[PDB]
């Protein structure tokens, strides 16, 4: 949980899903590494 972030796609294992970006009318997978 060092850093969570929207980002475009799906994401890493490690990186825990917080919720959900939606930026600009787009969906980024927020997830924390």
């Known amino acids: ?3 969570c ?3 475009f ?3 890493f ?3 825990s899903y917080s919720g959900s970006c939606n930026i600009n009318g787009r969906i980024f997978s927020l ?3």
């Open 31 to 33: 997830c924390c590494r």
């Open 5 to 7: 972030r929207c980002r």
């Open 1 to 3: 949980r060092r850093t």
């Open 9 to 11: 796609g799906r994401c």
């Open 13 to 15: 294992r490690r990186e």
